């Protein structure tokens, strides 16, 4: 719904295992995968709350089932059936539909997060990097592990690299 998952980011990463969303960096010191702890933690909190909040709204059944009627109480029996089966139907609906809708929403939720994360990095780099479009940015200045960790941590120092990036751009 937001265009991140299966959109401008085609597929997922098998090598990233520590989180749902993350970064893939490649500098002169090497390549590597990292997982965004903050975004994945927020997603975990949200999904746990969703699942549990849904579950506790249906209190567990505490009674029993089973009634017996003789031949002269058929109008009774049908009524009983008409209740029991009826209730089951409602609950079946209330379960199935629920999951369906919830499932869609959950996926959209994840999509949003990825999009949001992407946007954050944009707001950090501005014209210091070039949007390739596959999901990343090519830096206009040399970046080591320190500045990459700053980008992941959200503490990017735009003014420090502004002069060098301007020349190369």
């Amino acid at each position, epitope marked *: 719904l937001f265009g991140a998952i299966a959109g401008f980011i085609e597929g997922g990463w098998t090598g990233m295992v*520590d989180g749902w969303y993350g970064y893939h960096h490649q500098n002169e010191q090497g390549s590597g995968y990292a997982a965004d*702890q903050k975004s994945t933690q927020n997603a*975990i909190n949200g*999904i*746990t*709350n969703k*699942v*549990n909040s849904v*579950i*506790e709204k249906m209190n567990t059944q505490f009674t029993a089932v089973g009634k017996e009627f003789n031949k002269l109480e058929r109008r009774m029996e049908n009524l009983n059936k008409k209740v029991d089966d009826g209730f089951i139907d409602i609950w079946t609906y209330n379960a199935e539909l629920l999951v369906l809708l919830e499932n869609e929403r959950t996926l959209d939720f994840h999509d949003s997060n990825v999009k949001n994360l992407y946007e954050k990095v944009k707001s950090q780099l501005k014209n210091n990097a070039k949007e390739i479009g596959n999901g990343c940015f090519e830096f206009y200045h040399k970046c080591n592990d320190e500045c990459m960790e700053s980008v992941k941590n959200g503490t990017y120092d735009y003014p420090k690299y502004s002069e060098e990036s301007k020349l190369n751009r």
Partner: antibody
Amino acid sequence: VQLVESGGGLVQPGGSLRLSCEASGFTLSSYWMHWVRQDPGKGLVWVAVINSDGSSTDYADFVKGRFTISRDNAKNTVYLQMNSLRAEDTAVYYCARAPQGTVFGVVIIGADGFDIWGQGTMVTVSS
Amino acid sequence: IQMTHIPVSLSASVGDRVTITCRASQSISSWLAWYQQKPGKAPKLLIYKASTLESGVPSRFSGSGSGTDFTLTINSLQPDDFATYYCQHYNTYSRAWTFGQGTKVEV
């Protein structure tokens, strides 16, 4: 289901000790294993944690590489080896089990906390 | 992360409500567990996820809270409900396990 602890005893300062937990009733390979120490009278302090595969372990802020935690799922045991013990580290040590999580290590539905604990081994450091 | 217990110790009579509050230095969502320990024994888990009851725990225990302020209510205190109660922040992601000081309930 139960965990039994062994190895607790009196060790001089600067000494070493090796506590062991044996779990009877379940499989150790499907549970994170925690070591939690309680000073006599004081509260509960979490010491160490080992994962289901022994690859990821974590230790507390008051242990400066002194403790090493290991696991053996075939023998159904989890070991904690302390070295360079100081006088402060005298307590009853407990072995706790925690379920694994559906998402990564975080459980979404079902049991989450330290469901089953041990009985406690008294480790005393003195001269 | 720090867990603080209010009140540190409390006393109540059998058949009376009681509230034990755990406060967090930051927001720990619903990642709280309530344990009960009797003297010279091992703690038994009462509540996880700040609201769920462990199987076998009597329904008289009720947990409630989210974020930074949480509470354990023991409705209808019984003789077997006099112990020290601990709040724990557990987070398998981010690897954070922290225990409270504990509150002793007496009579």
